[PDB]
Amino acid sequence: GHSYEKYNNWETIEAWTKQVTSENPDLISRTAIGTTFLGNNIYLLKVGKPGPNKPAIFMDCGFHAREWISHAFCQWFVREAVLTYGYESHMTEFLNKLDFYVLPVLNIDGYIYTWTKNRMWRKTRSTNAGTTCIGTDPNRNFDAGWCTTGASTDPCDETYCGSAAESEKETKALADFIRNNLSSIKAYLTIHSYSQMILYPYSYDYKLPENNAELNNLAKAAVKELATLYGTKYTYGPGATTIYPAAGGSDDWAYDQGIKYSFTFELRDKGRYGFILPESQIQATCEETMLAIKYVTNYVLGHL
Ligand SMILES: CC(C)[C@H](NS(=O)(=O)CCCc1ccccc1)P(=O)(O)C[C@H](C(=O)O)c1cccc(CN)c1
Ligand SMILES: [Zn+2]
C-alpha cells in the first residue's frame, strides 16, 4: 500500500492519485495531460479551493528517475495541503486564493525502470534512431538555449538533449500545459535531488535574469526559513554559477515564458547517500522543504 514515509512504485502512486482525489473532491481534481513514451498516464493534481479565475503555482517532481525524494515530496505536499486546510491560516489562505498544479511524476517510464532494472537510471526510456541507446535527459530537452551548453548530442550519454527541443512526449506535455495557462501561472517550481540548493535562472547562459536581485533575496529568505526546522543548510544562486551550466532546462524555459518566479530545488543530501536517500529522512526532508515552498508561495501571493 501507499505510505508517505516510504518510496512508492508507480502503480502505487497512480492508485494514490485516484484515491486522494476521490477523498478530497473539494480540494483536488485530477487530470491527465498526456502519455509517456511507454503509455503511462501523466497525472496532474489541481490542489486548491475551486473558484473563478484564480492565479496558480506550478510544481513538478520526478524529472529525473533516480531522484526518489523528489517524487516523495510532491506526495507529501498534497497531504499537507488537504489535512491542514481550514486549520492552518497560511495554507487555508493559499488554497483559497490560488491553485497549486502538482505534477507528481513527470518521467514515469524512467521511474518504473529504477524500480525494475536500474536504480541509477536518469533519462526517459524512449528509443533513439540508429542506436540501441535509450533515453533523453528531460532537463536538457526544453527550448531554452537548447543543446548549446552543458548538453550532449549523443543518445548514449546521460545529458542527451534529444533529437530536438520537446522531442519527448513528457516534456512536450508539460510545455503544452504551461503555454496553455500562462495567464494564471505565476511561479514555476521543479523538484530535484540532491545537493541542498535553490537555483534560479540562468543555466543555459551566464547572463542574469532581469529580476536577479529579487530572486536572490527570495531564495536567500527561503533557505533561511528552511533551516529553522532542523538546521539543514542550503546554498543558492543562479544555476550556471551555483552548480554548472546546463542548457534546455525547464526552469529557464518557464522563466523566458514570462513566469518571473522560477526555481529549481535540490533536496537532501550533500552526497553521503546521494540519490539513495534513506526512507528515514523522507519526513524531515519534506517538512523543511514545505517551509521553503510555503514561504515562496506567501511572497508570490503578495506580488500578483
Ligand atoms: C545531484 C544533482 C545536482 C543532479 N546532478 S547529476 O545527476 O549529477 C547530473 C548527471 C549528468 C552530468 C554529469 C557530469 C557533468 C554534467 C552533468 P541534477 O538534479 O540532475 C542537476 C540538474 C541537471 O543536471 O539537470 C541541474 C543542473 C544545473 C542547473 C539546473 C537548473 N535548471 C539543474
Ligand atoms: Zn535532477
From the CB of residue 217, how many other CB atoms can be counted at a distance below 10 Å? 12
Distance 155 CA to ligand 2 centre (A): 18
The resolution, in angstroms to one decimal, equals: 1.4
Counted domains in the chain: 1
**244 marked as part of a ligand binding site:** yes
From the CB of residue 244, how many other CB atoms can be counted at a distance below 10 Å? 10
Structure-determination approach: X-ray
Instruction: Tell me how far apart the alpha carbons of residues 111 and 208 are, in angstroms, rounded to a whole number.
Output: 33
User: Which CA distances in Å does 39 have to 30, 94, 146?
Assistant: 18, 34, 26
In short, whether 203's Cβ falls inside 6 Å of ligand 1 is yes
Written as one string, the DSSP assignment of 10-37 is HHHHHHHHHHHHHH-TTTEEEEEEEE-T
Q: Which strand (E) or helix (H) includes residue 215?
A: helix 212-230
CB < 8 Å & 24+ apart, contacts of 295-298: 295/221, 295/222, 295/225, 296/187, 296/189, 296/218, 296/222, 296/261, 296/263, 297/57, 297/94, 297/98, 297/187, 298/90, 298/94
User: Which CA distances in Å does 144 have to 113, 151, 192, 210?
Assistant: 28, 12, 19, 16
Ligand number nearest CA of 161 is 1
Distance 67 CA to ligand 2 centre (A): 6
C-alpha cell at 158: 546521460
In short, whether 264's Cβ falls inside 6 Å of ligand 1 is yes
Amino acid, single-letter form, for residue 182:
L
Instruction: Tell me how far apart the alpha carbons of residues 86 and 113 are, in angstroms, rounded to a whole number.
Output: 39
Cα distance between the two ends of the chain: 40
CATH (domain of 59): 3.40.630.10
In short, whether 239's Cβ falls inside 6 Å of ligand 1 is yes
Instruction: Tell me how far apart the alpha carbons of residues 225 and 125 are, in angstroms, rounded to a whole number.
Output: 37
Radius of gyration of the chain (CA): 18
Domain that holds residue 20: 1-304
Residues 236, 237, 241, 246, CA torsion sign: positive
HSE on the CB side for 40, CA within 13 Å? 23
Residue nearest to atom 24 of ligand 1 (CA): 246
